[PDB]
Structures are given as structure tokens and as C-alpha cells.
């Protein structure tokens, strides 16, 4: 069976797009997002000439920050950004404009990304006994981005991703990680790159297919609501012999419709991963894309119109510190977790740090403790339930407890 997602209501798709539109005007290095550009170009929607300026800004920032003087003529210090994973997404952005990475600037960017994979391959080891410094998600993304531009990686690079899905790897990969690996493998297979691994790549695609389908929840999502978009992108790209893939994907469409109606998709990166699916496209369409299909011009959404809000109380707790932190914080209803953290700081006795990411603000330090290697600050709500959204998107209710927990992964 094939994974197919019948067309959704035009007004629902156009609402998703309206959430992206404010980002088309946010061109600072901190806010530029190649995933947003890719998702819009793969969608049935467009943002007009704003898209041209957005891609130009991407080219200015990614090339100036990573090459030569290595700072932005306009914006100054790039602060160690973009990352290599972000560079891979920039390469997808180029395919979304029917461009190949090229010239002496592009050739050097390609080798930087290849060095990233080589460095991760060395971190993992011929042994497979080490860990990537970033993640297997980024490792797969880097392989995908190169493959889309017809750039080869060595069998020994691909082996680390193969091993991670084969029967001897340790630990458990999320649906999102498995999906991105599957997308990388699919590009290699379609391109007949790495024929010295022809069969292991074929087997790996099937394995990912099976593991994603086994992760389908009763509500129909693959893993969770925010894993379903990339899971569907992977599943749409190959048939699955002897399985009920078609009904599995229809069950996911139901779950997505419910989640969409419930307001689940407001994060720009998450929207950017979902819009291709709702246009029957995936990142694998960037091998030979049709970049000039008609797309509907988006219009601005109604202006917010802020209203009267009651005060609420949220308990913020950090038990990963000695002495522990626990305080009741009052904020306006509809405030985000980040707003709670700002108030806690303003009251005294609390501090934290964030860094920018394509998903928004990422919490990196709490009360002077910065997360170290393979650690992170996990966000949870009562009872012992990890959030599915970040500090700038989760809006807690009165009486809720938000916990920040130091976790090793």
C-alpha cells in the first residue's frame, strides 16, 4: 500500500500559512530559518516577493558567516552560527529554488558540511561505541542535504546511520530521528549513491517504515503530534509491501485534522515540516523539484487585538539543584513558560539562559547550571509529563506546576 494524505480544507491550510507570514519579515541572523523557506516553497501557498528577499538574506548570512571574514557585513558577529545542521537546511532551501550549490563559495560550504559528517563519523568511531556530538537526526539531515545536491558521501559515513537502525545499536531513536534517517536513505537509494551498501540501505528503509508504524498511537499520530509531519514525509516516499500503510496514513490524517482544529500547529518550524505533506510533497521532491507550480498568495491574518486577562499562579520548580527551587509565580493568563521564567527572574532568586534555534528559544541554563554534553533541561508539567512544546509556546493554566529537570540522553 502507499501512504497518501487526501487534500485538506483550503481554509485550514491557509491558516497555517498565515502563521509563517510574520517570519518572512524577520531577516536578522537570529531569526532567519531555511526550514520555513523550504516548507513554503513545497506548499500550495506563497508569500510573494517576500520569498525572494528571504532567500537572498539566507544566502547573505550563510555565506558571509561561514566563509572568508566569517562575520556578517550587516549584522556583525555571527556568534558561531549558523550551525552545520542549519547549513544542511540551507542546502534544502537552495533546492526549493531549483538551484544547486555552486561556485567557489558553494563548493567550500559543501566541504564544510562533509567535514561535519566526518567529524561525527570519527566521534562515533569505527567501533560505533561513541556518540555524535549533535544527533543522529542532524547526521541524517546532513547526508540528505548533500545527496539532494548530488554530492557523495563515503560508505563509512553512511555506515554510521545504517548501524543506528540495524539490530546491534543501543538506545532508541525517536520517530523524528528515524524519519530523517529514512529520508536520507531514500535519497541515496533513488540516486544509486553508495551501491556498495545497496541491500543494507534497502533493509534500513523497510526497518524505518516498520518502526514508525509500530509507533502509531491510538489517536493516530506517529509517536506524537509533532513527529507525524516528518513521519508522513518519509512514509509518502516508498511503498511498503504487504502492510496497511494506506490506512495507517489515513488514521494519521484524522489525528492531524483534530490537532489542527485544536490549535496544535503554531510553531513556525513545525508548520514548515507539515505544509509539504499537505501539498503531497516531501523533502525527497527536492531531488528534481518543480519550483514553478502555482501557489496561492497568502494574506496577512487579522490583527491580534490584545484583551483583558486575569492573573494566574503557576508553580515553577527545579529539583535538579541543591538547594531546590520552588515558587508560585503570578502572570497574566495566556502567558508562556518563558514569561513565567522572566517573572521569576524579576522577583529575584531565579536565573536562566536561552539560545536561539530554528524552533525558537531553547533553554540552556537554569540557576547557573548550564546543560553539559548529552544533557538538557527538560520541561515538564504535572504529573511528571514532558511538554511537547517549548518555553515560548506552552501557555500554562492557573494552578499548574512547570518543572525544569536536568536530564541526560
Amino acid at each position, epitope marked *: 500500500e502507499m501512504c497518501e494524505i487526501p487534500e485538506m480544507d483550503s481554509h485550514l491550510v491557509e491558516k497555517l500559512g498565515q502563521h509563517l507570514l510574520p517570519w518572512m519579515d524577520r531577516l536578522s541572523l537570529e531569526h532567519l530559518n531555511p526550514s520555513i523557506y523550504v516548507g513554503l516553497r513545497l506548499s500550495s501557498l506563497q508569500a510573494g516577493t517576500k520569498e525572494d528577499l528571504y532567500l537572498h538574506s539566507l544566502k547573505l548570512g550563510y555565506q558571509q558567516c561561514l566563509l572568508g571574514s566569517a562575520f556578517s557585513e550587516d549584522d556583525g558577529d555571527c556568534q558561531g552560527k549558523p550551525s552545520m545542521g542549519q547549513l544542511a537546511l540551507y542546502l534544502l532551501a537552495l533546492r526549493a529554488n531549483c538551484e544547486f550549490v555552486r561556485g567557489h563559495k558553494g563548493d567550500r560550504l559543501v566541504s564544510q558540511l562533509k567535514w561535519f559528517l566526518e567529524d561525527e563519523k570519527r566521534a562515533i568511531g*569505527h*567501533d*560505533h561505541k561513541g556518540h555524535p556530538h549533535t544527533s543522529y537526526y542532524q547526521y541524517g539531515l546532513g547526508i540528505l542535504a548533500l545527496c539532494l545536491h548530488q554530492k557523495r558521501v563515503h*560508505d*563509512s559515513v553512511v*555506515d554510521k546511520l545504517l*548501524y543506528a*537502525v*540495524e*539490530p*546491534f*545499536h*543501543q538506545g*532508541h531513536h525517536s520517530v523524528d530521528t528515524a524519519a530523517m534517517a529514512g529520508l536520507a536513505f531514500t535519497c541515496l537509494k533513488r540516486s544509486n549513491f553508495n551501491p*556498495g*551498501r*545497496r*541491500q*543494507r540501505i534497502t*533493509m534500513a528503509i*523497510r*526497518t524505518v517504515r*516498520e*518502526e514508525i508504524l509500530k509507533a502509531q498511537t491510538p489517536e493516530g499520530h506517529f509517536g506524537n503530534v509533532y513527529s507525524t509531519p516528518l513521519a508522513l514525509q518519509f512514509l509518502m516516499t516508498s511503498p511498503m509491501r504487504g502492510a496497511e500503510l494506506g490506512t495507517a496514513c489515513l488514521k494519521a490524517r484524522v489525528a492531524l485534522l483534530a490537532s489542527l482544529q485544536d490549535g496544535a500547529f503554531q510553531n513556525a518550524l513545525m508548520i514548515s515540516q507539515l505544509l509539504p505533506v499537505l501539498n503531497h510533497k516531501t523533502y525527497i521532491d527536492l531531488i528534481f523539484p518543480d519550483c514553478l507550480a502555482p501557489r496561492v498568495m497568502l494574506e496577512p491574518a487579522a490583527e491580534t487585538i490584545p484583551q483583558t486577562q486575569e492573573i494566574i499562579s503557576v508553580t515553577l520548580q527545579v529539583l535538579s539543584l541543591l538547594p531546590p527551587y520552588r515558587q508560585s509565580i503570578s502572570v497574566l493568563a495566556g502567558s508562556t513558560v518563558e514569561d513565567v521564567l522572566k517573572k521569576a527572574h524579576e522577583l529575584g532568586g531565579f536565573t536562566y539562559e536561552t539560545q536561539a534555534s530554528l524552533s525558537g528559544p531553547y533553554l540552556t541554563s537554569v540557576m547557573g547550571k548550564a546543560a553539559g554534553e548529552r544533557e538538557f533541561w527538560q520541561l515538564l508539567r504535572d504529573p511528571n509529563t514532558p511538554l511537547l512544546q517549548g518555553i515560548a509556546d506552552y501557555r500554562p493554566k492557573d494552578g499548574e506546576t512547570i518543572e525544569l529537570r536536568l536530564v541526560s540522553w
Partner: nanobody
Amino acid sequence: LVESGGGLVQPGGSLRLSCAASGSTFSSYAMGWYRQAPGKECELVAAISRAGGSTNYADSVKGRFTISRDNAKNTVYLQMNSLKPEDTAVYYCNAAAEGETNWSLCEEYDYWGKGTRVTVSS
């Protein structure tokens, strides 16, 4: 840790090899027992379908070795009966490729585990 069960035996003796896989996808793979004899190249000895329904043996070994698996424990077994000197080798567990007449992935791997040494000598 992965491969175990090897040793030194008389001709006609028996051994049971175990291969414990740490990974969640074990059930998604055909598995094979491979061997590298002193001075020789990689050879698939026996392979088994994902479920256990179909098997595949090198001619040298049919009637004497039996491959089995336990997906509940993530383990592949090789029962080696009536051992011959020519069976002397290091034995390795790895994936295999189900086929209609299973098949070796000897040429698609460049990393093998430690394996387990088998020696049959008068």
C-alpha cells in the same frame, strides 16, 4: 557480549553459539552466522528469516548445523553438531538479506564484532 559459545573440541563434537543483539530492530532483520577461517575469506554459514520460517545453509554444513532465533530475547543461535576440522574459524553474527533461493551481506560490512573462536582438531 554479542557472540559467545565457541571453544576447542574433538571432531564430531558439538557446540552452541549465541548472539545477543542489543537493538530494538532485531525482529525486522534476517540474521546470519558468518565465519572467517584461518587465512580464508568471509563466508555465510547459516541465515534465518525475520520470523524463523525460512532458513538457508551453506552446503558444507547442511545436516550438521541448525540456526534458530528467539525474537523475545533478541538472540540468534547456531547449533553445531558433528563438528569437522574444516569448521575451524572465528564465527560472527550479523544481518542477512532474505531471498527466495537468504543471502550473505559479507561484502556490505566493514565492521564485525569480536566474534567467537571455534577450533576442531584431532
